Design a protein around this motif. Structure first.
Motif, PDB file in Angstrom:
ATOM      1  N   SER A   1       0.807  -1.218   0.000  1.00 25.53           N
ATOM      2  CA  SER A   1       0.000   0.000   0.000  1.00 25.53           C
ATOM      3  C   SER A   1       0.842   1.270   0.000  1.00 25.53           C
ATOM      4  N   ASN A   2       2.166   1.167   0.070  1.00 24.32           N
ATOM      5  CA  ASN A   2       3.040   2.311  -0.152  1.00 24.32           C
ATOM      6  C   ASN A   2       3.351   2.519  -1.628  1.00 24.32           C
ATOM      7  N   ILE A   3       2.883   1.628  -2.501  1.00 19.35           N
ATOM      8  CA  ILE A   3       2.909   1.897  -3.933  1.00 19.35           C
ATOM      9  C   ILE A   3       1.833   2.930  -4.233  1.00 19.35           C
ATOM     10  N   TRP A   4       2.245   4.076  -4.767  1.00 18.88           N
ATOM     11  CA  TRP A   4       1.284   5.089  -5.176  1.00 18.88           C
ATOM     12  C   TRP A   4       0.328   4.499  -6.204  1.00 18.88           C
ATOM     13  N   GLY A   5      -0.968   4.602  -5.928  1.00 19.12           N
ATOM     14  CA  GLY A   5      -1.988   4.015  -6.760  1.00 19.12           C
ATOM     15  C   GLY A   5      -2.549   2.711  -6.233  1.00 19.12           C
ATOM     16  N   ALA A   6      -1.800   2.009  -5.387  1.00 24.72           N
ATOM     17  CA  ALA A   6      -2.272   0.796  -4.736  1.00 24.72           C
ATOM     18  C   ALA A   6      -2.707   1.128  -3.317  1.00 24.72           C
TER      19      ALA A   6
HETATM   20 NA    NA Z   1      -0.482   3.659  -2.030  1.00 25.06          NA
END
Ligand code: NA
Ligand SMILES: [Cl-]
Ligand SMILES: [Cl-]
Ligand SMILES: [Mg+2]
Ligand SMILES: [Mg+2]
Ligand code: NA
Length: 332
Positions: free
Chosen positions: A104-109
């Motif tokens: 959830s630290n992936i931008w967009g996820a």
């Molecule tokens: Na994210």
DNA sequence: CGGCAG
DNA sequence: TACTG
DNA sequence: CAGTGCT
DNA sequence: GCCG
């Protein structure tokens, strides 16, 4: 207004007499957040701010329950951390949480995308790179994974804001540009740069994203676009990535919004934050039969409400019965 | 019992 | 609250 | 629409 | 999680 954080200065949290309590609650709040328990995490957020702002070290179950933002359940965890020094539930957080945080630290996820990848068996950004089906946003997010987690000196934010303002003011010298977010709240480091653009003539703001973005792309300043709806011509915001020229420069997040001058103060209030400050103030407006957004402060609608006059931030505070706060005092 | 910002 | 798909 | 991100 |  002891029950609202928008009614108080955020500097109260500077002398936190409960770090040993809040440092453990923050861990529980993060587990609930990455696991999707949005509301339970919200309650934890408000209790951590209440505890961070309390005047003395907490010592009593009764003393604790009296604090707005703390009920029975939270009180019992406190009395447990005080008595025993440790909190048992921290040793019973789902083992899934660290991976969920990674994803959830992936931008967009978000949480739903993270929970899905975990269920499908992915455990590392390597697995994500090589087996997940990613959106255009998530792919950019993944590519700048570390950079988007890194904060920048506020001096670099000023360079980035200046780059944007010079480009914009190049083709209309009357434009006003203002750096908002953590920058305007006075922080030493900024996770991104939030730029507010308007024109004080009430009309010359329209149709400038296109000119501005091409100008900033012609310079190589912009390196990726996250959100940029530039076909309908109703573009209000831009989210992307930039990098200043030269050696030793990192990719930084950049958000731009263009607003009509009539909405300046509300747009200024929303973009300056903090986010929890905004949700507090907006929650306070609802109780007073009003509705606050980035566009306006207005009255409740007809089972279309009136728009209240708000030429400055001060007037929004005054209409909600709040003492004014410098942006640095809104850091909740 | 339901909201929790818009 | 405004985007994406 | 659900999901996500912005403050 | 907390609140009214
Ligand atoms: Na994210
Ligand atoms: Cl609040
Ligand atoms: Cl103002
Ligand atoms: Mg920011
Ligand atoms: Mg931003
Ligand atoms: Na209480």
């Amino acid at each position: 207004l002891d029950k609202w954080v928008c009614a108080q200065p955020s500097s109260q949290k500077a002398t936190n007499h409960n770090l040993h309590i809040t440092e453990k609650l923050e861990v529980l709040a993060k587990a609930y957040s990455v696991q999707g328990d949005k509301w339970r995490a919200l309650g934890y957020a408000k209790a951590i701010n209440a505890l961070k702002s309390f005047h003395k070290p907490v010592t009593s179950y009764q003393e604790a329950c009296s604090i707005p933002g703390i009920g029975k359940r939270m009180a019992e965890k406190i009395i447990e951390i005080l008595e025993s020094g440790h909190l048992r539930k921290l040793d019973h957080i789902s083992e899934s949480v660290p991976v969920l945080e990674l994803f959830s630290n992936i931008w967009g996820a978000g949480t739903k995308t993270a929970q899905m990848w975990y269920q499908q068996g992915f455990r590392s950004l390597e697995d994500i790179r090589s087996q997940a089906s990613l959106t255009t946003q998530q792919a950019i997010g993944l590519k700048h994974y570390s950079d988007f987690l890194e904060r920048m000196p506020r001096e670099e934010a000023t360079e980035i804001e200046q780059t944007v303002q010079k480009a914009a003011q190049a083709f209309n010298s009357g434009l006003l540009c203002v750096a908002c977010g953590s920058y305007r709240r006075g922080k030493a480091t900024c996770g991104d740069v939030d730029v507010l653009i308007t024109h004080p003539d009430g009309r010359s703001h329209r149709g400038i994203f296109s000119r501005l973005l091409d100008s900033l792309r012609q310079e190589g300043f912009l390196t990726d676009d996250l959100v940029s709806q530039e076909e309908n011509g109703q573009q209000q915001k831009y989210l992307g990535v930039c990098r200043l020229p030269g050696p030793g420069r990192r990719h930084r997040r950049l958000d731009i919004i263009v607003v009509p001058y009539s909405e300046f103060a509300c747009a200024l209030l929303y973009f300056t934050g903090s986010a929890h400050f905004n949700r507090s103030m907006r929650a306070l407006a609802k109780t007073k039969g009003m509705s606050l957004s980035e566009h306006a402060l207005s009255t409740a609608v007809v089972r279309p409400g009136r728009v209240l006059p708000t030429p400055t931030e001060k007037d929004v505070f005054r209409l909600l019965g709040l003492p004014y706060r410098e942006p640095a005092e809104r850091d909740w």
